[PDB]
Amino acid sequence: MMIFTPKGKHLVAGEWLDGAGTFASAPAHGPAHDFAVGTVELVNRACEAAEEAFWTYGYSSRKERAAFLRAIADEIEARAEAITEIGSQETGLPEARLNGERGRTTGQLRLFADHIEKGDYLDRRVDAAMPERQPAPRQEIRLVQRPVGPVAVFGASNFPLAFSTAGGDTAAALAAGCPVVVKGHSAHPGTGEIVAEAVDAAIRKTGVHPGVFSLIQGGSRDVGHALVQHPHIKAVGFTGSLAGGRALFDLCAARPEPIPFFGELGSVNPMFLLPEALKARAETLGQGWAGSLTMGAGQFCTNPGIAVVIEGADADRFTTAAVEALAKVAPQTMLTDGIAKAYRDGQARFATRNAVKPLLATESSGRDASPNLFETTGAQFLADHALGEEVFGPLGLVVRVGSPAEMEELARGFQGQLTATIHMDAGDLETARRLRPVLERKAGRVLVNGFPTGVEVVDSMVHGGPYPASTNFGATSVGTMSIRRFLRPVAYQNMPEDLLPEDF
Amino acid sequence: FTPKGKHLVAGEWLDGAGTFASAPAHGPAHDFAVGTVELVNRACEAAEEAFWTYGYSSRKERAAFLRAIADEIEARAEAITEIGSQETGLPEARLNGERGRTTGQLRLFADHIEKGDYLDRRVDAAMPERQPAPRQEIRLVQRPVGPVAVFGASNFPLAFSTAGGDTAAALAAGCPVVVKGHSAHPGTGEIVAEAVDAAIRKTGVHPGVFSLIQGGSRDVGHALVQHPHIKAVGFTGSLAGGRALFDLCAARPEPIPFFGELGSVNPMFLLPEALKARAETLGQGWAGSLTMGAGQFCTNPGIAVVIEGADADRFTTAAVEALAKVAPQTMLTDGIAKAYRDGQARFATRNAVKPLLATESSGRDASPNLFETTGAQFLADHALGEEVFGPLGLVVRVGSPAEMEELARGFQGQLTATIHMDAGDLETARRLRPVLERKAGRVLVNGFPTGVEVVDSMVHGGPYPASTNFGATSVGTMSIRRFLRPVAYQNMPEDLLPED
Fold this sequence. Notes:
The structure is a homodimer.
Chain A: E1 10-12, E2 15-17, E3 22-24, E4 34-36, H1 40-57, H2 62-78, H3 80-91, H4 95-118, E5 125-127, E6 141-147, E7 151-154, H5 168-176, E8 180-183, H6 189-206, E9 213-216, H7 221-229, E10 235-239, H8 242-254, E11 261-264, E12 271-273, H9 275-294, E13 306-310, H10 313-327, E14 332-333, H11 337-351, E15 357-360, E16 368-369, E17 372-377, H12 378-383, E18 395-401, H13 404-413, E19 417-423, H14 429-442, E20 443-448, E21 487-493
Parallel strand pairs in A: 7-8, 7-10, 8-9, 10-11, 12-13, 12-19, 13-18, 17-18, 19-20
Antiparallel strand pairs in A: 1-2, 3-4, 5-6, 6-21, 14-16, 15-17
PDB class: oxidoreductase
Keywords: Structural Genomics, PSI-Biology, nysgrc
Assembly: dimeric
C-alpha cells in the first residue's frame, strides 16, 4: 500500500551504501524500516568527496547554483505524497503539518535561489588604484565573499523537513557554494532518505558534482564527532540540545584547526504581559498562549514556556483563560519515546516543587503528551534557577511579579533566548520602553503582540540568540542573512581582470 | 612628555600592584602600574555600566567621539613620536606615518557609521491579507555586542594598539573597550589613553566607554577574556598566546568570539616569465619588503617560491646583494631580538637549507638573512614553514609548475599569498589562484604583502593558523562586523523601536 519503501542506505556522493549493520526506525504508526548504521569510514568517504566537489561547486556561478536549488525544490515537490506518508509515520506529526512544512522547505530553497541571483550577499567592494598617492602608491583592491568549504549539517528532530536534510542550513550552505554532509537524525531516517532522493535527482539533472551532498544515517556518538573533527569540514550547522550542541562546539574549538560551530540550542522564550494589555485582552491573550504552547505537541524551539505578569485580577483572568483553553487539548504524539519520557520527567520536577502551584496537571502516557500549567511568584523564581528550565513539550509557567520594577528584575536575570515577547497596549509604552533594551540583549528576536512560535523565512529574520540559546555569536540560522555563516571574504590586490574569480 | 605611569579605569588614573620599568631603545625608562585581576574587574564592570548609554548612542554621537579621539591624538603628535620612537626603537618617520594611519582609520570608521549601510537594516512589510495567518512586519538591524577586550600589538604601537583598528571598530559599533596594553610600549599607550580621556571629557560620553590596563601577568589577560561582561575579543600577537586565549574563550560558561591575528609567512610565487624578465628588480623589491621595520610586519614575505634555473639564480643573487647592503635595525624588545636570533639558527643549523646571507645579529638589533632550500626538503620539515619574526627570507626552489602548485596546496592558512607574473604566466596564475585564495585572506599580484591599506575592501586575516577570525577582517570597514549582532524586531510599534 506504501507509496514509498526506503532503500535504508546512506547516500555518499551519488552512491547508495550500506553501513555497519542496521537499525530499525521507531515510527509512531506505519511499519518500522531497517537503516544502515553510519561509521567513521563512511564520514571520511563523504568528507573527501565534499572536498573534491568543492573545486568545481565552490567555483560555480550563482545562476548555476540558483538552478540547482530550484531543481532540489522541484524534486522535493515531486515527492509530496511519499514525504507526508513517511514523515507523519516517523514523527507522529499530523499529515497537515508535513504538508505545510514541505511548502516552507521548498519556498526557503527558492528564496535562497532568488537571493544569490541578486548578488548583493557577495559584498562586492572595490577601492581604486592610486598610483599618484604619496609617499607610496595605492594598488587596486577588491573584496568578495567566497564559500568556506564543505559544511556539516546536523538536522533537527522537531522540524524534519525545514530544519533537516534540505532545510535551512543545507539550503544556505549550498547557496553559498558549500557542499554539505548531513548527519541524519535517528528519529526520522526515512524522511531524511526521501529528501536525499530528491537532492540526488537534482544533482543528476543539473550535472553538479555528486560530492556536493551526502547523507549519513544513524551515527553512534563517535560518528557525529568524526564529522565535526574532519579536516575538510569548514563549519557546522546544528539544531538540537544544549548538552549535545555544547559538546560538539567544544570539539570544534579543540581541533588542530578550529572551525566555527553554529548551533541552535534551547530557549524558554519568555513573554511579558503588561498591565494595560492584560486588563483589556486577558482572555484572548490566555487562549493565544494556550495555542502557542500546544502547537506540534509543544515541540517548537520558539515555544513560550513562561508568561510574566503583574499579580492581580487581570492576571487571574489571563491564567483562567489559559487553563480553560488548555483543558480542551487532547494528547499529542511526540517525536520519540525518550522525548515523551523527558517531558514526564520535566512535569515531575514542577509537580514536586513546593515553590510552584499546579494550575493544570494531566497524566501523559507513552509517546503522548497532554498540556500542563504551573504558577509561581517572581521571588520564588528568582530564588530557584531550575524554575526557568526549558521543558521540551506543552508545559507553561506563569510567574506573578509585584511591579514593573520586579518584572525588569526578572528580565535582567534571564540567560540568552531565541526570543522574548512583550504584550502591550498603548498605555503600556513606558514599561515596554524599560524592557526593550534589556530584551534586545537577551534575544535574537523581540516580538510585540504576537506569539514566538511562527518563524518567518524572510530577509529580516534573526533566528538565534545569545548563548545558551545558540553558539551563533550573532549569526541567524533562518532568513537570507544565514548565508554569512558559510562565506569568508577575500581581498584581491592589483589583480588583472582575466585572473579575477568569476564572482566579480 | 613625562608619563604618570597609571592605568586609566573609567575616567580615573589608578595605581597597580607596584610598578614595572619600560625598556626603551633610547631615552629614559619610566615606571608604570602593574595590572591586576581586580583592576580588570573594575574596568569590565564600568564598561558594562557604560554600555547602557554608549551602546544606545546615535551614530552621529559616536562619529563625533571618533573624530574627537583623532583630533586629540593629532594634538599630541610630538609627544607620541618622542615616547614612541624611544620605546620601540622605530624611526621617528615611522611613528609619524603610523599616527596618520591611526587618525585616518578613526576617521574612516566615523565616516562609515554615518553612511549607516553597516547596520544592515532590512524590512519585510506586514501582510495582513495573508492567510492562513497574516504576516507581521519584521525589521532587522545590527547592534553592538557589548564590552570588548582589545589586546594591543607589539609591532604597530599606534595603529594596532590603544586606539588602533580593533578599538576603533569596537567604539564605532557602540561597544565600550577595555585595552590590555602591551608591556613593550606603555608610555605610547599612556599618551594615546590621555587623548581618548580628553575626547571622553570633551564629548560627554560615559567614562566607562574606555579603560587601559598596563602590564600585569598572564593571569590579567586571562581574567579579561573570561570576564562575564566581556562579549568579544580583538587580539594581535603570537600563535601560542592567541590560541591559548581562544581556548579560554571557548571554555567559558558563556563562550564569546575571539578574533586573533596570529602570524604567517606570506609566501610569494614568482612565475617563470616574470622571473625571466625582472629577476633583479624582483629580488630587490623582496629585499626592501623583507627588511622594512626591522622585518616586524605580520605580513612580512618570508618565503619566495621559484622554479629552479638560471632566472631563479639571478633573482637569488639580486636579493642577496640588496640584503647585504641593509644595516642592522633595532627591534621592538630584547625578547623579540633573541627570538629572531633563534629563528636564524633554526635555518643555519639545518643541513637541508643552504645559507646565502647568514650574518649574526647582536643585542637588540636584527641583521637580514637569506637561506635556500628545495620543495621536497621544505615539505619534509614543518619548522622551515614556520614564521620568523624579523628580516629573514627563504627561497624555495621547485622543479615545475605542477610542483609549485602542489607546494601551494601544502601551505597552512596565511594572511596573504602573492603571485609575481607577466602576461605569459597567466595560464599558470589561473591554476594557482583557486588554491591560494583558499589559503589566504588577501591574494596579491605583482606587489609585496607588507603594506595593508585601511579601505572598505581590505581583508586582513586568513584561515587558521593565520587568524581565528573565521572570515572576519581585522582591518578595513568590514571589521566592524566582529562587534555587531543582528536583532529582529517583530510587529513593533514605531514608538518602541530602537533609534537606528
